[PDB]
Amino acid sequence: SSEYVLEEPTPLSLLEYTPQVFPTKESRLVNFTLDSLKKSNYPIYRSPNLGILKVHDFTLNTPNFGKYTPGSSLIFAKEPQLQNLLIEEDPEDFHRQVTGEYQLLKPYVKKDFEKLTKSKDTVSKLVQNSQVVRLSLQSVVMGSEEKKLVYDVCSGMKPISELQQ
Amino acid sequence: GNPDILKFRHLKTLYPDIEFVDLEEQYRLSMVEAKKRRGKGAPKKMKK
Amino acid sequence: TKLKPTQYTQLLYMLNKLHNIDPQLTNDEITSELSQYYKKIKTLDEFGRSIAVGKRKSSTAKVFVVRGTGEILVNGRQLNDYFLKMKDRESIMYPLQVIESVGKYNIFATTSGGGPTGQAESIMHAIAKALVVFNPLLKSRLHKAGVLTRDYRHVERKKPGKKKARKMPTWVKR
Amino acid sequence: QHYDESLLSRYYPESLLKSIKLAQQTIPEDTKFRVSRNVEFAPPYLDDFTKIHPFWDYKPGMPHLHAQEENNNFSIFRWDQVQQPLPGEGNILPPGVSLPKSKSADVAAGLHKQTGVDPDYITRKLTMKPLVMKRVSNQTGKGKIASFYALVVVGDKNGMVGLGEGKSREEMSKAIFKAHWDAVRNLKEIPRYENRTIYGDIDFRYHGVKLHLRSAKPGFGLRVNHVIFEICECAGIKDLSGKVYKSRNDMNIAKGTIEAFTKAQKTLDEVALGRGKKLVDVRKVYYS
Amino acid sequence: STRPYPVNVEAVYYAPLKLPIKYGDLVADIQLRSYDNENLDFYSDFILRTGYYLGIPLTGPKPLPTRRERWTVIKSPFVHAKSKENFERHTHKRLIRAWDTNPEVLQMLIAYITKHSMAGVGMKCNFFQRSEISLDLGSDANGLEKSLSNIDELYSLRNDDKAQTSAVGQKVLELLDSPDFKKHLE
Amino acid sequence: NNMKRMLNNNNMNPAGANGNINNKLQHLNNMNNWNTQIYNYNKNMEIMNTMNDKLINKLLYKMMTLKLNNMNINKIIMSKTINQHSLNKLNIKFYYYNNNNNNNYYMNMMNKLMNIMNNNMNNNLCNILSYYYKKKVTIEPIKLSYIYLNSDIFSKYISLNDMDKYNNGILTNYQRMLNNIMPKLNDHNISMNYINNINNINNNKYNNMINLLNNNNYIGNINNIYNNMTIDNIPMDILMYKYLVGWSIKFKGRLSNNNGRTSTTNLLNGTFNNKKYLWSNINNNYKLNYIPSNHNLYNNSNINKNGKYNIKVKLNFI
Amino acid sequence: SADLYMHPEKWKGLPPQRILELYWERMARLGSEYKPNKDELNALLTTSEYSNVPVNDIKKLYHRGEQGAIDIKNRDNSLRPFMFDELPSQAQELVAQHREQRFYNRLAAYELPLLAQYRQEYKRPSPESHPVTYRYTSYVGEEHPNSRKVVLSVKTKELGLEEKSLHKFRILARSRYDHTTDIFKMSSDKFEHASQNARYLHDILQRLLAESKDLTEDDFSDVPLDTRHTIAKSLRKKKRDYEFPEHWKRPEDAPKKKFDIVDQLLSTL
RNA sequence: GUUACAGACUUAAGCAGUGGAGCAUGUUAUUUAAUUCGAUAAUCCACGACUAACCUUACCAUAUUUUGAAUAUUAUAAUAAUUAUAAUUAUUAUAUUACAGGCGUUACAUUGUUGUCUUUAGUUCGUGCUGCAAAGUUUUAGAUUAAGUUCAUAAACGAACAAAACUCCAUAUAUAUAAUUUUAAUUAUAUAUAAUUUUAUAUUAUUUAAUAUAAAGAAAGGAAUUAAGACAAAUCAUAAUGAUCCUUAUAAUAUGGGUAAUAGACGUGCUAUAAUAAAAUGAUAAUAAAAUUAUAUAAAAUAUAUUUAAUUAUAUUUAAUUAA
Ligand SMILES: [Mg+2]
Ligand SMILES: [Mg+2]
Ligand SMILES: [Mg+2]
Ligand SMILES: [Mg+2]
Ligand SMILES: [Mg+2]
Ligand SMILES: [Mg+2]
Ligand SMILES: [Mg+2]
Ligand SMILES: [Mg+2]
Ligand SMILES: [Mg+2]
Ligand SMILES: [Mg+2]
Ligand SMILES: [Mg+2]
Ligand SMILES: [Mg+2]
Ligand SMILES: [Mg+2]
Ligand SMILES: [Mg+2]
Ligand SMILES: [Mg+2]
Ligand SMILES: [Mg+2]
Ligand SMILES: [Mg+2]
Ligand SMILES: [Mg+2]
Ligand SMILES: [Mg+2]
Ligand SMILES: [Mg+2]
Ligand SMILES: [Mg+2]
Ligand SMILES: [Mg+2]
Ligand SMILES: [Mg+2]
Ligand SMILES: [Mg+2]
Ligand SMILES: [Mg+2]
Ligand SMILES: [Mg+2]
């Protein structure tokens, strides 16, 4: 039995709730910023850490949270406050998301192959193989450096031993 | 599943104030105690 | 809950007899006592044809029946080309054959789903409904013939333990 | 219906006035407004939603889905009592119900309904006594089905006495209640000389039991089988001698003795009337 | 009874209004999936209502066909395989389609929808962007600056009269404003 | 004829007369048959979410029992949680039971536990859950004053707390108490009254429509359509399930010290048929297509010295 | 202010109930990290006249929580009979649904009209200038791997090409170009993000256009349009190409307008 | 190892099969280092097992692990997060016992669940009444229904778990929605209404009930639900738990083998034994439904088998869509 306190809707209140994939350029930047904040482990989806609780300031977002292979139990690392908090905000990620920049690998030229192997037909075959690999690896999603390494291995520019590390 | 999930161990870490009781564990302990009492406890493990 | 059928029948008898009193001689009191115990049309289109949708099994047949000289077109092709079995054609004809109006009505059938015999049956069903609009007095006759009844016969599902709907796997007493 | 701003302000609060104005601007005057049959967005009663209800809307400080508050702020720090109690009238009692020695009172009330008997009398003046308290069973296809059998003399201690038996598959308390009920239904005025003993030396057979009950001089107590004694205590007999022969089946004793009292006895006055004679009591005349 | 119930209340009580479609430029379609109806239909109705307030011509809950994921199982834990039980799961699907809206309004709508979402209902959005054939991401810094200005215009506090505010959104805006963010590309 | 057409167009009301619908106070949402109220387009993710939810339930159960310096062990009974997965946020919720103005000045163990769920600024349980789901979580406890309003709680409580009353055999007093929870409500009468009330409401709305009326199907203003219809009158009468009509509780297993064999012991009260569906427009519906809506069945299986046993409970709710 | 519980020094002049509420808040917020205060104690003592508790007793309770209460001082009342003052589980669920409905009605009434402030008229990009349609998809609550999928789609006649170049473009497209509807579309899922994929698609389109406009020692005038994929697709689908014969129509047999006199009388406007 | 009736896929017709043949699969027996364990009358035998190469697996041979998967107790030390070079916490490491673990044994210790009697019509409780009483009546004269199902008659009157009904699928109609390019509007899906159908004329038996006829209707099925008790029916190999036994072994990991062995026997199937029946062919591609496709569905097209090509099978390479 009381009056309805009408808090007015605003674009700012509906920020965060904006679609992660929306055509607009303005929206893309915002989405990127949100992603960067999430990566930093900003209090989104949760109440913030301020200078009130001192001991129990725990977090679960450690370097390998929901993962098995790193041998540990649940690690309650202390969170920073809202002050003294850094944001990652990397350039490569920005390039990927905001603009539509992609690496595409590099096609291996015939000259490089000639450096190692002698015969011409064999070199041409190796080049063809490398080309075949390239398109497949572009299609697949793995990781910038790892994918490149794999591509090199497939080509024969690097040996098999470099994978097993 | 997600291996990092909250357990009873943590429910002491997060909330020390509340003296929780894990019932299944307590039951197991009681059973062990009973076994010890009536000469049906586990034999001592070999080391070598 | 204590009301019995016999009691109800008696009550009805009592009311009916009272009601039967010649309306001119009836009283106000009697009528007051009895007071307690009381209590879309299809047409042709712009172009003068009667649309009707019939169904059987999985089949559905939307059929445009029109007053022009009796020719058939099933699903955008000739009747003998579509329905190879003469039985299906005979079935289709039957609504026009119970009436003396095969040759009177042009029919443009459009079927979908099911197999051929079921499709033909659905078309027939649709045609009967279409005919009913042209002359409502024949509706009873069509119903009697057994064309206005939607044939419900629906394929029974395979039940778990059974092989087919009813076909069970062999029993073994020993 | 497009109302003026001042009128709206008079009936509606200052927060929603702007929203109302906006709604008026957006939605035209010429509007059809269809009735959505296949889905109902709004409630089945009229309500201007300006006032938040205590029970029928969400509690403001409490957390839930559709909270519309921050993760920190939830004004609800005591969970001992219930958060949203029932609106208007506190109860949800149906029509014709009420909220919750007592057993005896309930019995008396039930008797008053069924047979017009005075409840207050039943509660106070009548006092009961169990005579037999069997557990009893029937061999059913399900199995052996046990049943608690009671047999309970009730009696105002002024010659008004009744026997009653009762039975329940559920525990013996219910069986005893039933026996008590039966006893009060079967209350019976026994005749007795000087309000203390039977008139003559009676000798009565009820089925197996052969009863013999002698009258007694005043002061000489109840000197009889325990069932008989129990019945006499309730029925107001102070003085009695007697002995049971043949069967001594407790139930049949209890049934037989009340029958003997009601039937085998003749009051002196009745005898006098029948015979047409004076029938004096010599002791009374003497004055002891 | 001398109690003026204004038009918004009336609209709530009746079925939801729909604005007409000027041009068939399907901007976005929103599919709503759920494992039941009652919540889903309500949610769709709410979406329609909010879409009305905005200029956009949302069509309406076109029911796409329900799925049926069946699974059979022997009832017993051991043998009795002649007795078997079925199980089913119906993915109920409804379609909304927005027809004429400047992207920002559409975004706002979608954001509003996801804010006050209901329990059982999942959602998917297909947005459509009618772009020209030839494009250029060369004249970059100026275009970034323009985008930032547009964002600032969008998220400006007109009158702080106890309006709805978000901390994360404010932070995002601050980040967008910063010199470091401007630097990123070059 | 026009007036009749207009009425037909607008003819809707709460179901339950003899143009009507089951309102949200007259039946359960089928979403409230399942415990993980979710749809996701990627089914792997949905599966992962429901696993998480199940794991959280166990954690909550574990939390629910407290200790007070090894003096008192107050076992708060909780229902099975129901997890509401909106696009924005999860909301976990459960019903719970706990067994002069002196306690305004110290926090009870139960109170502390409840505070932990949402109120501890950084430290709270909801915050920690949010990491597993990647969305804001809200745990809402709901207190039940009686043991027998929720079926799960009733069964659970009997399994955990009242061991001594049935371990040898069901004590007589305890059995009597179980029998006489409710006051033997004439369920037929209540259902009939409810139906009559619904009819009266329908008549009232119809009467109002007639009064308004004295190609477009718009009637008068809202105030005049819903003339006598208010929050005070209608909602509580329309509210479907309110009255525990009948209930059955079964104890089963090795609940006999002398005997080696098992013992099925059943307590039955009232009725499990509903007479609101028998003679009216409102129809019965089936939860997971096999449990009559009004019913709610549950069991909970505590281990004894002798071995395993369980306690089925089944309530009717008119 | 909101941050009031944190400062126990400030609240002595408040009413007793308010003080109690603040105390409860303080206890809640720092559950395990609670540490008693003198000012807070004094406030609690001052409040004591509100709820009937003596001054020593309140202090004792403050010092020792539940243990103190126990020292100051029960029967099991689990199956105590129903006093008709609390709804069951199903009932409570129905109530909650009704609360939700009411909330949504309120939102519709007073927040959606507010939302109409943020309203813009449609600013149409013309089909002549903007023929291509990059459709993006987004799954709201989930993180689907199809959110990266972007689909370009254009009518080939709407592209700025000469006739020879258009044919060459169509030939290059192969399966991507449908011929019944003059539409060429293609989707990319190769890259991590949606924007990347869109950019890649755009680059492909540009490359295709460049190839079409070359004509230097490569015309493709004498390679007919391969329409096998389209006919296969058509076969897979069904067709309803047939129509009612136009010469079978009978406008004369159609139902004529029946004269309604009362309706005519009514129509005075 | 009894009486009397009534019932249906019980029997009788009828249609197609099994029993003969070969193969598949399960079982038995025997074999084997191991052929893992259970199910084994109806109520086992393509059953547990909706796929045994490795895995799964539990079995066997040979190797090698010994606080091991947990929880708690007690100590040393190292790294990372947080704060304003110290400290608080969280973890890890090495140990330290209680133990952990056990598809080991007993469903004749249990749970839950299931099979059969069983969609069979039974199973009980109040208040009253009868009998000294255990008990009986209610819950049945006689009939009827699919039916403790309605009639009727009756010391009974009500009430419960079953039955029926509400439920789901399918059907008919109406309304709503779908800018009829996600179209199939001949549709899909929410919400209703509809029937356990109604009415009347007659002909037999006693106001009704079966047959027939007629006029009114789209009006005709399937699924789920299988009570109480019983069978110490099945399951400790889904899982859990009691008791009991193993603890450098009955626990744990790898490499291979086995579960696929074959005299006879037993079920279930598959393919057959040719002309009321088999094979080639049939591109303005004769006519379906239901369901699956981000641990993917793979179109067109090229190449080889194959002198044309089609067919069928692979390879080449991924167009389209994560889906009316
Ligand atoms: Mg008697
Ligand atoms: Mg036969
Ligand atoms: Mg043979
Ligand atoms: Mg054979
Ligand atoms: Mg075997
Ligand atoms: Mg066995
Ligand atoms: Mg079989
Ligand atoms: Mg192995
Ligand atoms: Mg083993
Ligand atoms: Mg053990
Ligand atoms: Mg069992
Ligand atoms: Mg019988
Ligand atoms: Mg009997
Ligand atoms: Mg179409
Ligand atoms: Mg049934
Ligand atoms: Mg049974
Ligand atoms: Mg057994
Ligand atoms: Mg056995
Ligand atoms: Mg065991
Ligand atoms: Mg075994
Ligand atoms: Mg096990
Ligand atoms: Mg071993
Ligand atoms: Mg085998
Ligand atoms: Mg042949
Ligand atoms: Mg063909
Ligand atoms: Mg192909």
The CA distance from C149 to C131, in Å, is: 14
Look at the block and give the residue holding tokens 């001992």: D80
Mutate to test the interface with A, among F41, F51, F127, F128 (most CBs of A within 10 A): F127
Residue D137: helix, strand or coil by DSSP?
strand
The CA distance from D84 to D66, in Å, is: 17
DSSP-derived secondary structure letter, G33: T
CA/C1' separation A58–H93 (Å):
24
Look at the block and give the residue holding tokens 């159609």: G254
Mutate to test the interface with D, among F231, F237, F238, F240 (most CBs of D within 10 A): F231
Cβ of F136 within 8 Å of Cβ of A46? The answer is yes
Strand E121-131, strand E62-64: pairing: unpaired
Strand D144-156, strand D160-162: pairing: antiparallel
Touching pair E, C by Cβ (3+ pairs < 8 Å): yes
Cβ neighbours of G32 in A, within 8 Å = 55-56
Cβ neighbours of F85 in E, within 8 Å = 119
Residue D26: helix, strand or coil by DSSP?
helix
Burial class of D120 by CB neighbour count within 10 A (0 to 12, 13 to 18, 19+)? exposed
Q: How many residues does chain F have?
A: 318
Helices (H) and strands (E) in chain B, counts: 1, 1
Cβ neighbours of G244 in C, within 8 Å = 47, 49, 64, 108
Cβ neighbours of D63 in F, within 8 Å = 118, 138-140
Experimental method: cryo-EM
The two three-digit tokens of residue F120, written as one number:
């501890």
Cβ(D130)–Cβ(D151) under 8 Å?
A: yes
Q: How far apart are the first and last CA of chain F?
A: 41
Centre of ligand 12 to C-alpha D165, Å, is 28
* Bridge partners (DSSP) listed for residue C65: C50, C107
| Host H or E run for residue D211 | strand D210-214
Cβ within 8 Å of residue D79, ≥6 positions away: F110, F111, F114, F115, F141, F143
In G176-253, where do the E strands start and end? Answer: 183-188
Cβ within 8 Å of residue G188, ≥6 positions away: G149, G150, G197, G198, G200, G201, G204
Cβ neighbours of A87 in E, within 8 Å = 175
The neighbour count for residue A71, using CB atoms within 10 Å, is: 5
Residue E66: helix, strand or coil by DSSP?
coil
Strand C49-56, strand F77-78: pairing: unpaired
Cβ(A28)–Cβ(A98) under 8 Å?
A: yes
The CA distance from F213 to F229, in Å, is: 18
The CA distance from C134 to C49, in Å, is: 9
| Host H or E run for residue C145 | helix C139-145
DSSP C39-90: -------TTSEEEEEEEETTEEEEEEEESSSS-EEETTB-HHHH--SHHHHH
Residue F208: closest CA among F189, F222, F218, F190: F222
| Host H or E run for residue G166 | helix G163-173
Strand F90-97, strand F77-78: pairing: antiparallel
The CA distance from A121 to A132, in Å, is: 17
Cβ neighbours of D1 in E, within 8 Å = 4-7, 10
The 3-state secondary structure of chain F reads: CHHHHHHHHHCCCECCCCCCECCCCCCCCHHHHCCEECCCCCHHHHHHHHHHHHHHHHHHHHHHEEEECCCECCECEECCCEEEECCCCEEEEEEEECCCCCCCCCCCHHHHHHHHHHCCCCCCHHHHHHHHHCCCCCEEEEECCCCCCCHHHHHHHHHHCCHHHHCCCCCHHHHHHHHCCCCCCCHHHHHHHHHHHHHHHHHHHHHHHHHHHCCCCCCCCHHHHCCCCCCCCHHHHHCCCCCCCCEEEEEEECCCCCCCCCCCEEEEECCCCCCCCCCCCCCCCEECCCEECCCEEECCCCECCCCEEEEEEEECCC
In chain C, where do the E strands start and end? Answer: 49-56, 59-66, 72-74, 106-112
- Looking at chain F, which residue has its C-alpha nearest residue B7? F59
Cβ of D19 within 8 Å of Cβ of A6? The answer is yes
Say how far residue G140 (Cα) sits from the centre of its chain.
6
Strand H, nucleotides < 7 Å from a protein CB: these are 38-39, 41-50, 66-68, 70-72, 80-84, 88-93, 96-101, 109-116, 123-129, 132-136, 150-152, 157-162, 164-168, 170-179, 181-193, 207-208, 215-225, 228-230, 232, 234-235, 237-248, 267-269, 285-292, 294-295, 299-301, 317-324
Distances D213 to C126, D216, D224, E168 between C-alpha atoms, Å: 100, 9, 8, 101
DSSP E71-127: EEEESSSSS-TTSEEEEEE--EEEEEEE-S--HHHHHHHHHHHHHT--SSEEEEEEE
Strand F247-253, strand F265-269: pairing: antiparallel
Touching pair F, A by Cβ (3+ pairs < 8 Å): yes
Angle, CA of F82, F88 and F93, to the nearest 5°: 20
Say how far residue D106 (Cα) sits from the centre of its chain.
3
Cβ(C134)–Cβ(C96) under 8 Å?
A: no
Q: How far apart are the first and last CA of chain C?
A: 53
| Interface list for A 28-47 with G (CB within 8 A) | 28
The neighbour count for residue D77, using CB atoms within 10 Å, is: 21
CA/C1' separation F39–H17 (Å):
49
- Looking at chain A, which residue has its C-alpha nearest residue D87? A1
The neighbour count for residue C10, using CB atoms within 10 Å, is: 11
CA/C1' separation D274–H255 (Å):
119
Mutate to test the interface with G, among D19, D68, D69 (most CBs of G within 10 A): D19
Query: Chain D closest CA to E125's CA: distance in Å?
Result: 22
Of residues A22, A37, A94, nearest to E107 (C-beta): A22
Cβ of A60 within 8 Å of Cβ of F128? The answer is yes
Centre of ligand 10 to C-alpha E75, Å, is 31
G116: contact with E, CB 8 A cutoff: yes
Cβ(C108)–Cβ(C63) under 8 Å?
A: yes
Strand D165-168, strand D144-156: pairing: antiparallel
The CA distance from D123 to E37, in Å, is: 60
Query: Chain C closest CA to E83's CA: distance in Å?
Result: 6
Strand D222-223, strand D240-242: pairing: parallel
The CA distance from G186 to G176, in Å, is: 6
Strand C72-74, strand C106-112: pairing: parallel
Query: Chain F closest CA to E134's CA: distance in Å?
Result: 34
Centre of ligand 15 to C-alpha F316, Å, is 18
* Bridge partners (DSSP) listed for residue D214: D241
Touching pair D, C by Cβ (3+ pairs < 8 Å): no
The CA distance from A126 to A123, in Å, is: 5
CA/C1' separation E73–H48 (Å):
12
The CA distance from C89 to E85, in Å, is: 44
Cβ pairs A/E, distance under 8 A: 117
The CA distance from B4 to A156, in Å, is: 41
The two three-digit tokens of residue C114, written as one number:
């099911």
DSSP-derived secondary structure letter, G176: G
Which CA-bearing residue is nearest the C1' of H39?
A: E79
Residue G151: closest CA among G180, G186, G127, G183: G186
